[PDB]
Motif scaffolding. Structure first.
Motif, PDB file in Angstrom:
ATOM      1  N   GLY A   1     100.101 -14.851  62.052  1.00 60.47           N
ATOM      2  CA  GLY A   1     101.482 -15.115  61.693  1.00 60.47           C
ATOM      3  C   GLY A   1     101.599 -15.162  60.185  1.00 60.47           C
ATOM      4  O   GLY A   1     100.948 -14.362  59.491  1.00 60.47           O
ATOM      5  N   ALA A   2     102.355 -16.138  59.678  1.00 58.57           N
ATOM      6  CA  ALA A   2     102.469 -16.345  58.235  1.00 58.57           C
ATOM      7  C   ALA A   2     101.808 -17.655  57.793  1.00 58.57           C
ATOM      8  O   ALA A   2     102.137 -18.187  56.738  1.00 58.57           O
ATOM      9  CB  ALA A   2     103.931 -16.326  57.821  1.00 58.57           C
TER      10      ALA A   2
ATOM     11  N   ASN B   1      97.002  -9.601  51.243  1.00 57.51           N
ATOM     12  CA  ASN B   1      97.468 -10.662  52.123  1.00 57.51           C
ATOM     13  C   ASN B   1      98.439 -10.015  53.108  1.00 57.51           C
ATOM     14  O   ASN B   1      99.230  -9.181  52.691  1.00 57.51           O
ATOM     15  CB  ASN B   1      98.219 -11.723  51.293  1.00 57.51           C
ATOM     16  N   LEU B   2      98.380 -10.396  54.386  1.00 59.77           N
ATOM     17  CA  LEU B   2      99.194  -9.784  55.463  1.00 59.77           C
ATOM     18  C   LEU B   2      99.929 -10.853  56.277  1.00 59.77           C
ATOM     19  O   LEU B   2      99.453 -11.986  56.438  1.00 59.77           O
ATOM     20  CB  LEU B   2      98.306  -8.967  56.439  1.00 59.77           C
ATOM     21  N   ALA B   3     101.114 -10.504  56.771  1.00 61.24           N
ATOM     22  CA  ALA B   3     101.850 -11.361  57.684  1.00 61.24           C
ATOM     23  C   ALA B   3     102.614 -10.446  58.636  1.00 61.24           C
ATOM     24  O   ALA B   3     103.317  -9.544  58.196  1.00 61.24           O
ATOM     25  CB  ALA B   3     102.827 -12.270  56.911  1.00 61.24           C
TER      26      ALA B   3
ATOM     27  N   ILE C   1     105.840  -6.060  59.116  1.00 61.64           N
ATOM     28  CA  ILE C   1     104.573  -6.390  58.451  1.00 61.64           C
ATOM     29  C   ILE C   1     104.891  -6.588  56.980  1.00 61.64           C
ATOM     30  O   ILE C   1     105.434  -5.702  56.338  1.00 61.64           O
ATOM     31  CB  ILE C   1     103.563  -5.233  58.529  1.00 61.64           C
ATOM     32  N   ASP C   2     104.544  -7.742  56.439  1.00 59.54           N
ATOM     33  CA  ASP C   2     104.714  -8.020  55.024  1.00 59.54           C
ATOM     34  C   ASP C   2     103.315  -8.027  54.401  1.00 59.54           C
ATOM     35  O   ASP C   2     102.393  -8.648  54.950  1.00 59.54           O
ATOM     36  CB  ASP C   2     105.375  -9.383  54.822  1.00 59.54           C
ATOM     37  N   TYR C   3     103.142  -7.293  53.302  1.00 57.26           N
ATOM     38  CA  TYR C   3     101.856  -7.278  52.594  1.00 57.26           C
ATOM     39  C   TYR C   3     102.037  -7.616  51.124  1.00 57.26           C
ATOM     40  O   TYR C   3     103.123  -7.395  50.557  1.00 57.26           O
ATOM     41  CB  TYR C   3     101.119  -5.931  52.745  1.00 57.26           C
ATOM     42  N   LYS C   4     100.983  -8.196  50.535  1.00 58.46           N
ATOM     43  CA  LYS C   4     100.943  -8.530  49.111  1.00 58.46           C
ATOM     44  C   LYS C   4      99.561  -8.199  48.514  1.00 58.46           C
ATOM     45  O   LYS C   4      98.536  -8.650  49.016  1.00 58.46           O
ATOM     46  CB  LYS C   4     101.255 -10.015  48.888  1.00 58.46           C
TER      47      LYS C   4
ATOM     48  N   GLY D   1     105.209  -5.573  49.587  1.00 62.40           N
ATOM     49  CA  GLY D   1     106.035  -4.658  50.345  1.00 62.40           C
ATOM     50  C   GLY D   1     106.167  -5.000  51.811  1.00 62.40           C
ATOM     51  O   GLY D   1     105.504  -5.909  52.307  1.00 62.40           O
ATOM     52  N   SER D   2     107.028  -4.261  52.504  1.00 64.83           N
ATOM     53  CA  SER D   2     107.235  -4.459  53.929  1.00 64.83           C
ATOM     54  C   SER D   2     107.252  -3.140  54.703  1.00 64.83           C
ATOM     55  O   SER D   2     107.638  -2.098  54.181  1.00 64.83           O
ATOM     56  CB  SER D   2     108.545  -5.209  54.164  1.00 64.83           C
ATOM     57  N   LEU D   3     106.827  -3.216  55.955  1.00 65.35           N
ATOM     58  CA  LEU D   3     106.837  -2.102  56.879  1.00 65.35           C
ATOM     59  C   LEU D   3     107.640  -2.608  58.057  1.00 65.35           C
ATOM     60  O   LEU D   3     107.353  -3.688  58.565  1.00 65.35           O
ATOM     61  CB  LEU D   3     105.403  -1.763  57.346  1.00 65.35           C
TER      62      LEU D   3
END
Ligand SMILES: [Zn+2]
Ligand SMILES: [Zn+2]
Ligand SMILES: [Zn+2]
Ligand SMILES: [Zn+2]
Ligand SMILES: [Zn+2]
Ligand SMILES: [Zn+2]
Ligand SMILES: [Zn+2]
Length: 275
Positions: free
Chosen positions: A23-24, A136-138, A152-155, A216-218
């Protein structure tokens, strides 16, 4: 003219980062970084002044050794200094007869090869949860009986690597259950594979320099014929060159050898994110 050759040897630190995100909640992130230090020797050389007088000792020091949580040197080829006046570096002596033996053998078994690689150290790098992951992934899923939404949020995480370098050939792969008939929303562009029933995004490079500072986001929305979908782990790949996660380095002690090159790289191993 009458001098001991400097002998050319290559070194490599190749590190693999495994991470699991849930999750986050960064608290549940589980990270494991493994690595190996490999020495490569040019063809057949083996003995290049080993007779009269004696061959130069191959001895090396690993810099920032304390960054390694666990280390297993090759027991056939190395011995080291105890102690462990914890001075952050560690000196290793290579067993020259066992090395000559070893480099003769594979030269007989891989006789058309220009170079011979030898696993010198296997190790594990001290990690500290999400701070230690380069990306980092969420992930979040909304599962309707007739629809599935995926985000999907990535940093890009600068402080996971000793030097700031790009993540290359980044891939985000997610299997989509439930009998997808079409994707009615997607951003940025992705590829839907109907055979394997999974979606794939590819980003060539991710770094501080990237268009969004590496954040960014997918997003995708799928129509279902036999839903609901069940969330499945996102699986991520990427490679990077020019940096390690450990920050370990290597230097030669005494004469006889020169590092033609010291390669540093890391790549995702098992790198997953759950809903
Ligand atoms: Zn020579
Ligand atoms: Zn441990
Ligand atoms: Zn030894
Ligand atoms: Zn040792
Ligand atoms: Zn061997
Ligand atoms: Zn290996
Ligand atoms: Zn030095």
């Amino acid at each position: 003219m009458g001098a001991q050759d400097t002998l050319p040897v290559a070194a490599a630190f190749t590190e693999t980062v495994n991470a699991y995100f849930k999750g986050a909640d960064p608290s549940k992130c589980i990270v494991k970084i493994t690595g190996e230090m490999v020495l490569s020797f040019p063809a057949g050389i083996t003995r290049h002044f080993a007779n009269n007088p004696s061959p130069a000792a191959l001895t090396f020091r690993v810099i920032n050794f304390s960054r390694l949580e666990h280390v297993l040197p090759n027991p056939q080829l190395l011995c080291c200094d105890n102690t462990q006046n914890d001075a952050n570096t560690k000196e290793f002596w290579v067993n020259m007869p066992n090395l000559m033996t070893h480099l003769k053998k594979v030269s007989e078994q891989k006789p058309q090869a220009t170079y011979y690689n030898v696993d010198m150290l296997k190790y594990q790098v001290s990690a500290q949860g999400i701070q230690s992951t380069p990306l980092n992934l969420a992930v979040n899923w909304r599962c309707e009986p007739s629809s599935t939404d995926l985000r999907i949020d990535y940093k890009y995480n600068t402080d996971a690597m000793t030097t700031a370098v790009a993540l290359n050939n980044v891939q985000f792969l997610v299997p989509i259950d439930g009998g997808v008939t079409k994707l009615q929303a997607v951003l940025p562009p992705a590829v839907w594979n109907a055979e394997q029933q999974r979606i794939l995004w590819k980003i060539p490079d991710i770094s501080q320099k990237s268009e969004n500072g590496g954040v960014g986001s997918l997003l995708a929305r799928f129509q279902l014929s036999e839903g609901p979908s069940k969330p499945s782990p996102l699986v991520v790949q990427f490679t990077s060159e020019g940096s390690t996660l450990s920050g370990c380095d290597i230097e030669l002690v005494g004469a006889g050898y020169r590092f033609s090159l010291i390669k540093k790289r890391f790549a995702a191993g098992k790198y997953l994110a759950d809903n």
